[PDB]
Amino acid sequence: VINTFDGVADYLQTYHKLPDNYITKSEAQALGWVASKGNLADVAPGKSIGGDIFSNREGKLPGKSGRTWREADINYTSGFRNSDRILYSSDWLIYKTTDHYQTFTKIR
Template identity: 60%
Template sequence: MALLLLILGQQGILPLGDTADAPDSLPTATIAAALTDSPTSAPTQAPQQTAINAPQDIADYIFAHGTLPDNFMTKSEARQLGWDSSKNYVSDVAPGYSIGGDKFGNYEGLLPDASGRKWYEADANYTAGPRGAERILYSSDGLVYYTNDHYQTFTEMHPSGK
């Protein structure tokens, strides 16, 4: 694990010191790419695993693995594939994928704040077409929340115990 963190830090993917230097988004394929010898590219087909889209399933995956499932990509990754939120849908350019991993500002202060804590967001219950109002918000220190009304209210999530 220490070697992985060192590699990611040396590549500028993760900060080596203060979390204030943490990136604004964490591409979901970052760790896998850092551990392989061959270069990776943006996905051209649906993810290998069954897509994880239900809020509790996403939360359970984050609790177990500390990251999003592989059927998520950042907005930047989707744009590289041709996604333009004003012209098409994520499902048009990346079938089977959802948006997730981008920084969430928490500017309204509705989620718990702590020194060094960073918040990230992910679509929930997305399969195709327009993105809905449901999101998972997860923090750099392990908190997970769900909103079904596009950031108006939040419910803290816990592992389901599956």
């Protein structure tokens, strides 16, 4: 399981995909995840949420025609989700947030 800022950031820039321990919220829901119960580890042990599109509505991340931003949870192990996310563009800019998408800083 690769779920560290550095680990995932490097994996993404190289292989251009998230490591196989990631699933989208959609996928997780189909497996019986209930966000309000914090039960993701019960129904999908070893998995973390990640790969969903991030809408960047506050336009805090640098925009660009054709550029798409996605997110993945970092440091998740069990229970309710934390506030740590990796944000990555289709042109492999990598940003991080530890404060629920309020502030972002570049890590690659």
